[PDB]
């Protein structure tokens, strides 16, 4: 589906948490994680 942007900006902290989320199975991509805050 549709997305609010074509660039999602990650700080180191945010990228690290997002990657944890994906390895957990909670999300499929760090982009999905980003969209929920």
């Amino acid at each position: 589906g549709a997305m609010a942007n074509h660039i999602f900006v990650f700080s180191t902290q945010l990228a690290n948490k997002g990657a944890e989320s994906v390895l957990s199975g909670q999300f499929q991509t760090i982009i999905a994680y980003h969209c929920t805050q």
Partner: protein, 62 residues
Amino acid sequence: GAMAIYPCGMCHKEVNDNDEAVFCESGCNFFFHRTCVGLTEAAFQMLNKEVFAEWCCDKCVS
């Protein structure tokens, strides 16, 4: 072009073609060693792999 060395924004040492590195696209225009900024190996792989994703240094965030 001109022959140059691109220093890490953290440690100020050379970032070369076999370093694992990121680039701040939000303003400072510095390359950084992945290690110097605290990026996990997994976060680095996922940023690089996701075409919609972009990294930012701590100074440029605000």
